[PDB]
Amino acid sequence: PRGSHMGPSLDFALSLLRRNVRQVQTDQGHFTMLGVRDRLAVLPRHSQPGKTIWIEHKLVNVLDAVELVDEQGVNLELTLITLDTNEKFRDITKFIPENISTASDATLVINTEHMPSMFVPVGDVVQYGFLNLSGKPTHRTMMYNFPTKAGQCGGVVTSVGKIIGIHIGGNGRQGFCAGLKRSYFAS
């Protein structure tokens, strides 16, 4: 979908890439990191950041690490890091939806040393989970068509101006991401 209707979405993604999406490496391997605001960034949990991670080849100290849980105490599989540099990240929290959102023409932004500035269109992003009695989804990962093979863990799922989730895995036919909501970063 290189077509005109994709204009604004692609723009937002290109922008987000530049200002906020960074290449990273931990003892665990190469990951795609998203900076949220100030010294805040998110990684996939299974990247298990140490006291020091590599950011675009500059080595940086990690002052605070905190795995995240939704309001129900479930594990979201996202680690939220606090970095030791003067540089501040453009705050993009304003593009994270009020509450977890599906999408119709989403694209996945991947940015690791081994796979730089890669945009992958993933089409429909869906919610796949259970229903707490009466309704409303508890236990929730988003998922989309993604026939590849584990990695690149870290991706950013974007639609039209919305930061929608963080890619945290796949199964060779589908990919799953931790749905994001503004609340998770209120501090």
> Which residues carry out catalysis?
46, 77, 153
Alpha-carbon distance of 83 to 180, in angstroms, equals 21
- CB of 156 within 8 A of CB of 127? no
Written as six digits, the tokens of 69 are 């849980």
Alpha-carbon distance of 59 to 116, in angstroms, equals 18
Q: Which of 102, 107, 53 is nearest to 82 (CA)?
A: 53
